[PDB]
Write a protein that binds this ligand. Structure first.
Ligand SMILES: [Mg+2]
Ligand SMILES: [Zn+2]
Ligand SMILES: [Zn+2]
Lengths: 87, 1415, 131, 107
RNA sequence: UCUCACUGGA
């Protein structure tokens, strides 16, 4: 159906991130990085893809979309950038 | 996996659907023509019998013809056979359902017996629940047993609504194994029920019959419930085994199939030819029995069919029932690759996230990383070094899944690494891996640490991570799992490393700390005497791995540079710290240096001990982790470890027998103290000889003597232990270890010096295994403590052999309890895990199961995490009325509630203003309504409570940053203080929907924390004592908002499994008025079964009066159960033939008293003087009770109480009266109540406390009476007037639910479980048990924690099946053909996907536009 | 010495402290069918197949009882035809290595040419060992 | 309201499913001698209307089935007179969050 | 070539 996407108002989830979402984002961007992707920020002479992904996610610079599965089977989408990585 | 990549579309599973075969479907599927019972190797040659295995079924290596599905042994699923069952046979597990469905049908037609002609059948067909619906229909169709053709409907009786006819009678069939006897029943008509007859009946049972019987005519066919074509598994299910040549050793299922096919030939040849109608009946039963014993061999056909050479059978119910079974052995966690297991060893020179791997593991543990241009030089250098060194390479996996095997060929320095390949490099440093020790018990039972390759093959760990692993260095073993993909490494490194785990969710404390040697060393070090020279300060300051290079100023420079080594410890502690403890009389002038004070890494005063650097509630490690974070905590451990390491290496700490021996005259005092203890036991024994012992209620004279002996003995033991402990001086090293808290206790030094004490077995002291004596060296009938198990001397002087035998018993008891409690706590652990496995917390902060059933609305009622929750105090809940008004009350229009202008710079102009006075009286009335609310919530009123982020810490952090000088008044605006309070009160977003349900939920959730926050950031607090600035206030509110919205619960934690493990840990630490606890209590509560071994309850007195003893005696007398056995000795039938004057001279006066119509049978009952003073029972009350309880055939006659025999004469009031009268007087003696309700056993009159708020403002520990009793009948003990029935308490939760409603039953379950766990002394968080208790009381009753309840709930099949009920519930879900949603953890474990939870609880999708944007 | 572990003078371990020999023995059988068929212990070759090096064998597939053994040596040479020559030798122990010590060439009550090997192996007290 | 002193015949209970909608109660005098909501472990129960049930099930993305349940013969449910299909709010005290809402269907 | 039995350690 896809009759199940809330628009970007009244989003009941957080404007933060979680540790688990953070983990999957870091791992997924790391999987691209170690799978020979175009990087977006400069290397600090760094071949350490976990540290590379942490450098990228320091400034909301990782091109991905999160699908938070709502608790009935519907979902919202989420930009990576509008979150707050405060922790 | 999967060479020759192809074009099939790929997905993951969403449907698990069950159901039964058609025989025609098996004929559609299979490619078999199975008739040869001879198996394989046609004429004993390496070739293919086409009857069994390979009629183009699966073949083995080097012989590939598998109907072109060759593929070797791998890469080819096998294919299925079939069986031409001529006579139809049963399916063995389905036979119970077959009986329960043949009770519902008229035979030879197929029609339902009982239809919508019946009102109860009509109302019971409305159940849209298949299993319980068929259960109710089976209960209705066991009622009437004859097909009724003309049926009266539910309108009127005289008209007869017809249906299908054929009014035959249904015979009562009772089960006999493979035989179901049909005895039609006048005329007992025992008939063997034909499989062909019931075949035709089920072939005639119809559409509405199935669907109204809860079954699926699409899938679930009870006429498919009968085996008539059986498919045959391939050799890729049943393999073959050789002795280097195929001589002996084929497979058991192969020979079962050859057996059943031989039995099939036996049934074949007697139907293909002549028919013995009493011996062709066994031509089937052989085939039926063999195909039935194939799938199951625990049947009531008790011949096991024990196969040859002593090995009985190999069947599929035995294959599938778990614990080395198929499901539980190969599907929920198996033996793995990329594995490493060795012994462990310690070192403190490594660090907290480091583990020392042996070099030869590093030569064989490896990692397949892809060819990367970022270190192509180093990776090609590794493959140039080769597989025969440390920095080498093992394989070069090519681009399409092709392993280059290096060393066995001739070119170990071969090809440059092509882009797209995978070099299988060995382990290098700083790839952190998984590292676990079995048993696994909690979140912390696995962790991750970086690699530091070493020689000398052990596994290292730092010595303060060996505490939460619960390992030790006795060679206890730990495993090593190396993660494999890039994102796997990312996941483990970003979550499962130790500094992320440090604060523990178990009971919200730190789980690590500082342990024995480092601990006692830091205990000796921070003593004030530890003066240090110059170059050693230089050496330790290099030893700290992150010195600032600053040589600190020496605190003593008088001539000479010295140091009070607390200061050089303070250079290890990083910045921004405070702590304060105030132990007993520590008011800033400590004559003991006990307590603490830290500023920013300057120890002001105090020793360092376990309650600072260990695992403690106000832990310094806790404060370090909260104020900075995990990596600063990780460096804290390294600093304190290596600093105290070097100081211990060049000071030393020893111990020995000099720490054990006390001084001479004090050992003399010890021995005379135990002598006066034996003087006390000698006096009370000689008082027992005179038998004058006032036994208090609860126990007899002997046990009332026993408790006094045990109490006086152990009281003397611990008094002598205190005498020893204060004898000893500072140089007692074991006393120094005691004040360290590394090992031992005051009891340990008491045992090693003063006396051993008291041995025991099973709670008692030593009882006579012989008669009258424990040992032949003792007299008979000794209740001296020396035979009853006292031991006189400590370990120093020794063991006389009687004491040695007592102590050998006291230790072997402990080995009994470990060797049984490991088994039962392991079962209770695995039961609680498999119960609460799937309860996660979803994005709207609500708690759900596998099937979307909502369990908790907000987790822990706030969404506050056990990974964060601290303990802070209240301030409002105490205080007097006038003191609290002086404390928080602000007014300018009064005398003393004014402010001082030394706090507020604008304190002059503020005066008298109502435009602020209304706000101040708003806030004060707000907090007084809050005070009433807190005393509504917490009845006692203790103040330390599990709450989130510490207000008190955060304002004192702002103090020690922004340099509050307490002389200048502050620039803070009072309206700004009140507005900031209000704005942050409306800021704590946990729920994020904008309507009234969500807003009421958010306010009601964080109500108590907001009460705390306003009680703290009240006006007189923030002015008078915290004294902030504008910048301090704004930074404080920014920090409260920041860390509160950081410490809100995230979504995705498997809070169920983590809750199960956190209640399953402290059950392990348990050991064993006499009311039980421990693993029997836990098993009685989780297995909720009714036969509980101590069902006690408690009542209180009337709420009017306080502690009135006469009235408490009245209540316990009015409740106290009283029968005639309790009051009688001599129940006598006489025959006094004169029923107007007694032939016994004791009772002359009484008949002419009574006459101021009978029998000559004198019926005499004695009462004793003991019982009618045990209860306040009047003889006239008793006689009138006998009167008003019989009232039919007896003339009641009393006696005199003032005369000391109490005789109940009776006769009979209108000869064969005694033959029934003896059973009648039995029924008098033991079947008639006299007081109270039944099950009112031993009633204990206790004077407990009553921690109440005062009628003047403060708290009061008040005295009252609270009774104790050990029965249960809650409805009847409740209704008795004279109690406090709003505050009654029982443990018996079944009666508590059925008397006071399911939610109160849940809450009493909770208080019961929490108190009987924390009676041990241990602690756990509220919320884990909260989740557990709610899943107990969610389905409506009290679901027992076993296979009686939740694993009999309506949830998913494959999630339900993995608690040892495999055949039963699998055949069940095949009978009802269920759809399992694949929304379950164990389901995705079984089927091999990502588990749909946590870091599997979302998707990740690539954006198209930001890809264009970021360049 | 945190958590009871003990610390060792390595020099006395050179001097002999807790030094120890270790004696495991083997078996091998020229097997016996029911039809009186005897098997053979002789030096095997390629004529279930291994690839172990024959470098320390004897005339009859044995190993001389005074030689250092290592790696994956073939322990007892054994052959058996059916009326071919199989790889019925048994290779070395993957978990231990040492010196072959003592070989006796015996039989049973019914004449199976039975040869045995005991192994000696020195063992020094290394760090991950339990005391 | 129908209140027996000690017994009501079980065969007399075959007259109960008779007419919609007026329903006859059945109560022990002795069991109701003290209140079964005055007890301090019993949390206060509050009813719901059906449009607010629609409100709740649209707010929480829920249905009839996914809810925490109760049985009809529950003692305080018969104290409140609760029939098949309703929703009852339960507002209970606690420790770590002060107050918390609880919802029970009545199947 | 493994099934089972019995020891052994935590
Ligand atoms: Mg151990
Ligand atoms: Zn095939
Ligand atoms: Zn019929």
């Amino acid at each position: 159906l896809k009759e199940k996407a809330i628009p970007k108002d009244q989003r009941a989830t957080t404007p933060y991130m979680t540790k688990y979402e953070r983990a999957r984002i870091l791992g997924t961007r790391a999987l691209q990085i170690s799978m020979n992707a175009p990087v977006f920020v400069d290397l600090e002479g760094e071949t350490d893809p976990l540290r590379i992904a942490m450098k990228e996610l320091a400034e909301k610079k990782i091109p991905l979309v999160i699908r938070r599965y709502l608790p009935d089977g519907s979902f919202e989408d989420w930009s990576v950038e509008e979150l707050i990585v405060d922790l | 996996v999967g060479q020759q990549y192809s074009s099939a579309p790929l997905r993951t599973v969403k449907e698990v659907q069950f159901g039964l075969f058609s025989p025609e479907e098996v004929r559609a599927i299979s490619v078999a023509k199975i008739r040869f019972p001879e198996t394989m190797d046609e004429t004993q040659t390496r070739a293919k019998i086409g009857g069994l295995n390979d009629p183009r079924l699966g073949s083995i290596d080097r012989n590939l013809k598998c109907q072109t599905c060759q593929e070797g042994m791998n890469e080819c699923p096998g294919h299925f056979g079939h069986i031409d069952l001529a006579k139809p046979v049963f399916h063995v597990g389905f036979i119970a359902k077959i009986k329960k469905v043949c009770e519902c049908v008229c035979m030879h037609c197929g029609k339902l017996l009982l239809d919508e002609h019946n009102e109860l059948m009509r109302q019971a067909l409305a159940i849209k629940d298949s299993k319980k619906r068929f259960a109710a229909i089976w209960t209705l169709c066991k009622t009437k047993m004859v097909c009724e053709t003309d049926v009266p409907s539910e309108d009127d009786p005289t008209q007869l609504v017809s249906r299908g006819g054929c009014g035959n009678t249904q015979p009562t069939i009772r089960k006999d194994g493979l035989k179901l006897v049909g005895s039609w029943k006048d005329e007992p008509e025992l008939r063997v029920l034909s499989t062909e007859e019931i075949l035709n009946i089920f072939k005639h049972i119809s559409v509405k019959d199935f669907t109204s019987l809860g079954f699926n005519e699409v899938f679930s066919r009870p006429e498919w419930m009968i085996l008539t074509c059986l498919p045959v598994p391939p050799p890729p299910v049943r393999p073959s085994i050789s002795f280097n040549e195929s001589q002996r050793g084929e497979d058991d299922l192969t020979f079962k199939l050859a057996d059943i096919l031989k039995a099939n030939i036996s049934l074949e040849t007697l139907e293909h030819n002549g028919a013995p109608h009493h011996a062709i009946e066994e031509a089937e039963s052989l085939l039926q029995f063999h195909v039935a014993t194939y799938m199951d061999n625990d049947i009531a056909g008790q011949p096991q069919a024990l196969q040859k050479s002593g090995r009985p059978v190999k069947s599929i119910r035995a294959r599938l029932k778990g614990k080395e079974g198929r499901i539980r052995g190969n599907l929920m966690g198996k033996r793995v690759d990329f594995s490493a297991r060795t012994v462990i060893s310690g070192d403190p020179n490594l660090e907290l996230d480091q583990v020392g791997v042996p070099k030869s593991i590093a030569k064989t543990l490896t990692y397949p990383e892809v060819v990367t241009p970022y270190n192509i030089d180093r990776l090609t250098q590794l493959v140039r070094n080769g597989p025969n060194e440390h920095p080498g390479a093992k394989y070069v996996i090519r681009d399409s899944g092709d392993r280059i095997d290096l060393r066995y060929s001739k070119r170990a320095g071969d090809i440059q690494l092509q882009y797209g390949w995978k070099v299988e490099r060995h382990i290098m440093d700083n790839d952190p891996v998984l590292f676990n020790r079995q048993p696994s018990l909690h979140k912390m039972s696995m962790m991750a640490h970086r690699v530091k390759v070493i020689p000398y093959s052990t596994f290292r760990l730092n010595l303060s991570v060996t505490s939460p692993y619960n390992a030790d260095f006795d060679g206890d073993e730990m495993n090593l799992h190396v993660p494999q993909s890039e994102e796997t490494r990312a996941e483990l490194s970003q979550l499962c490393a130790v500094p992320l785990q440090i604060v523990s969710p178990q009971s919200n404390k730190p789980c690590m700390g500082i342990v024995q040697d480092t601990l006692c060393g830091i205990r000796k070090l921070t003593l004030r005497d530890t003066f240090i020279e110059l170059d050693q300060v230089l050496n330790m300051l290099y030893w700290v791995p992150d010195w600032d290079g600053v040589i600190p100023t020496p605190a003593i420079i008088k001539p000479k540079p010295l140091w009070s080594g607390k200061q050089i410890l303070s250079v290890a502690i990083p910045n921004g710290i405070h702590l304060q403890r105030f132990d007993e009389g520590t008011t800033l002038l400590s004559p003991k240096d006990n307590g603490m004070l830290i500023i920013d890494g300057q120890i002001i005063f105090g020793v360092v001990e376990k309650k600072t650097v260990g695992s403690s509630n106000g832990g310094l490690i806790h404060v370090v982790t909260r104020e900075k974070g995990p990596q600063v905590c990780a460096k804290l451990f390294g600093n304190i470890q290596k600093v105290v390491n070097f100081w211990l290496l060049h000071n030393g700490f020893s111990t020995g027998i000099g720490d054990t021996i006390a001084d001479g005259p004090t050992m003399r005092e010890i021995t005379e103290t135990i002598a006066e203890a034996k003087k006390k036991v000698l006096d009370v024994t000689k008082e027992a000889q005179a038998n004058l012992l006032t036994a208090k209620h609860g126990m007899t004279l002997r046990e009332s003597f026993e408790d006094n002996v045990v109490r006086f003995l152990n009281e003397a033991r611990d008094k002598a232990g205190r005498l020893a402990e204060v004898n000893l001086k500072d140089l007692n090293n074991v006393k120094q270890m005691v004040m360290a808290g590394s090992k031992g206790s005051f009891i340990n030094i008491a045992q090693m010096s003063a006396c051993v004490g008291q041995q025991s077995v099973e709670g008692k002291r030593i009882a006579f295994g012989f008669v009258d004596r424990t040992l032949p060296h003792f007299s008979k009938d000794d209740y001296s403590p020396e035979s009853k198990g006292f031991v006189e001397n400590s370990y120093l002087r020794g063991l006389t052999p009687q004491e040695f035998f007592f102590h050998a018993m006291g230790g072997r008891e402990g080995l009994i309890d470990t060797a049984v409690k490991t088994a039962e706590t392991g079962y209770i652990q695995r039961r609680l895990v498999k119960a609460l496995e799937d309860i996660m917390v979803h994005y709207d902060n609500t708690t759900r199961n596998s099937l979307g059933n909502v369990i908790q609305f907000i987790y822990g009622e706030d969404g506050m995490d056990a990974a964060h929750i601290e303990k802070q105090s209240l301030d409002t809940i105490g205080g007097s009325d006038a003191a609290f008004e002086k404390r928080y009350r602000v007014d300018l229009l009064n005398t003393d509630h004014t402010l001082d202008p030394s706090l507020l710079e604008s304190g002059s102009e503020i005066l008298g203003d109502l435009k602020l006075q209304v706000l101040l009286d708003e806030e004060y009335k707000q907090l007084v309504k809050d005070r009433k609310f807190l005393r509504e919530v917490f009845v006692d009123g203790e103040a330390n409570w599990p709450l989130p982020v510490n207000i008190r810490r955060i304002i004192q952090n702002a103090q020690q940053t922004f340099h509050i000088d307490h002389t200048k008044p502050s620039d803070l605006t009072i309206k700004d203080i009140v507005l900031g309070v209000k704005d942050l009160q409306e800021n704590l977003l946990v729920l994020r929907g904008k309507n009234e349900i969500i807003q009421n939920a958010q306010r009601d959730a964080v109500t108590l924390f907001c009460c705390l926050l306003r009680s703290r950031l009240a006006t007189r607090r923030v002015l008078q004592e915290y004294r902030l600035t504008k910048q301090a206030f704004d930074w404080v509110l920014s920090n409260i908002e920041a860390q509160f919205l950081r410490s809100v619960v995230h979504p995705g934690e498997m809070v169920g499994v983590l809750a199960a493990q956190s209640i399953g840990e402290p059950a392990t630490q348990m050991t064993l008025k006499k009311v039980t606890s421990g693993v029997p209590r836990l098993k009685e509560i989780l297995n909720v079964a009714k036969n509980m071994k101590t069902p006690s309850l408690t009542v209180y007195l009337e709420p009017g009066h306080a502690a009135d003893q006469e009235q408490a005696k009245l209540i316990r007398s009015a409740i106290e159960h009283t029968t005639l056995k309790s009051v009688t000795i001599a129940s006598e039938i006489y025959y006094d033939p004169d029923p107007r004057s007694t032939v016994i001279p004791e009772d002359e006066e009484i008949i002419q008293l009574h006459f101021s119509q009978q029998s000559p049978w004198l019926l005499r009952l004695e009462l004793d003087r003991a019982a009618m003073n045990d209860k306040d029972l009047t003889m006239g009350q008793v006689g009138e009770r006998i009167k008003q309880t019989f009232k039919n055939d007896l003339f009641v006659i009393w006696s005199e109480d003032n005369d000391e025999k109490l005789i109940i004469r009776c006769r009979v009031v209108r000869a064969e009266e005694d033959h029934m009268l003896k059973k009648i007087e039995n029924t008098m003696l033991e079947n008639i109540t006299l007081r109270g309700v039944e099950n009112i056993e031993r009633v204990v009159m206790m004077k407990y406390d009553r921690k109440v708020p005062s009628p003047t403002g403060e708290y009061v520990k008040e005295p009252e009476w609270v009774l104790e009793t050990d029965g249960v009948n809650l409805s009847e003990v409740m209704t008795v007037p004279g109690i406090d029935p709003t505050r009654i308490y029982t443990n018996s939760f079944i009666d508590i639910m059925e008397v006071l409603g399911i939610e109160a039953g849940r809450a009493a379950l909770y208080k019961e479980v929490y108190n009987v766990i924390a009676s041990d002394g241990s602690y756990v968080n509220y919320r884990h048990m909260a989740l557990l208790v709610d899943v107990m009381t969610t389905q409506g009753g009290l679901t027992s924690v076993t296979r009686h309840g939740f694993n009999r709930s309506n949830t998913g099949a494959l999630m339900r099946c993995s608690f040892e009920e495999t055949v039963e519930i699998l055949f069940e879900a095949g009978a009802s053909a269920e759809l399992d949603d694949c929304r379950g953890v164990s389901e995705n474990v079984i089927l091999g996907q990502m588990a749909p939870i946590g870091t599997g609880a979302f998707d990740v999708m690539i954006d198209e536009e930001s890809l264009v944007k970021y360049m | 010495n945190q958590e009871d572990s003990m610390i060792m003078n390595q020099s006395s371990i050179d001097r002999g402290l807790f030094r120890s020999l270790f004696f495991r023995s083997y078996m091998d059988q020229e097997k016996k069918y029911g039809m009186s068929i005897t098997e053979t212990f002789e030096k095997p070759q390629r004529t279930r197949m291994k690839h172990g090096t024959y470098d320390k064998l004897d005339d009859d597939g044995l190993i001389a009882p005074g030689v250092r053994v290592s790696g994956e040596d073939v322990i007892i040479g054994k052959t058996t035809p059916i009326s071919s020559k199989r790889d019925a030798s048994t290779p070395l122990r993957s978990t231990e290595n040492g010196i072959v010590d003592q070989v006796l060439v015996t039989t049973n009550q019914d004449g199976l040419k039975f040869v045995k090997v005991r192994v000696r192996t020195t063992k020094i007290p290394q760090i991950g060992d339990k005391f | 309201i129908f209140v027996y002193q000690n017994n009501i015949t079980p065969s007399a209970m075959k007259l109960v499913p008779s007419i919609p909608p007026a329903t006859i109660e059945t109560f022990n005098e002795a069991a109701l001698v003290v209140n079964i909501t005055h007890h301090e472990l019993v949390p206060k129960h509050i009813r719901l209307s059906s449009d607010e049930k629609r409100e709740l099930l649209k707010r929480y993305r829920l249905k009839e089935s996914q809810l925490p349940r109760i049985q009809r013969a529950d003692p305080v449910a018969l104290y409140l007179g609760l029939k098949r299909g309703e929703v009852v709010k339960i507002i209970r005290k606690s420790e770590t969050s002060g107050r918390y809402a609880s919802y029970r269907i009545c199947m």
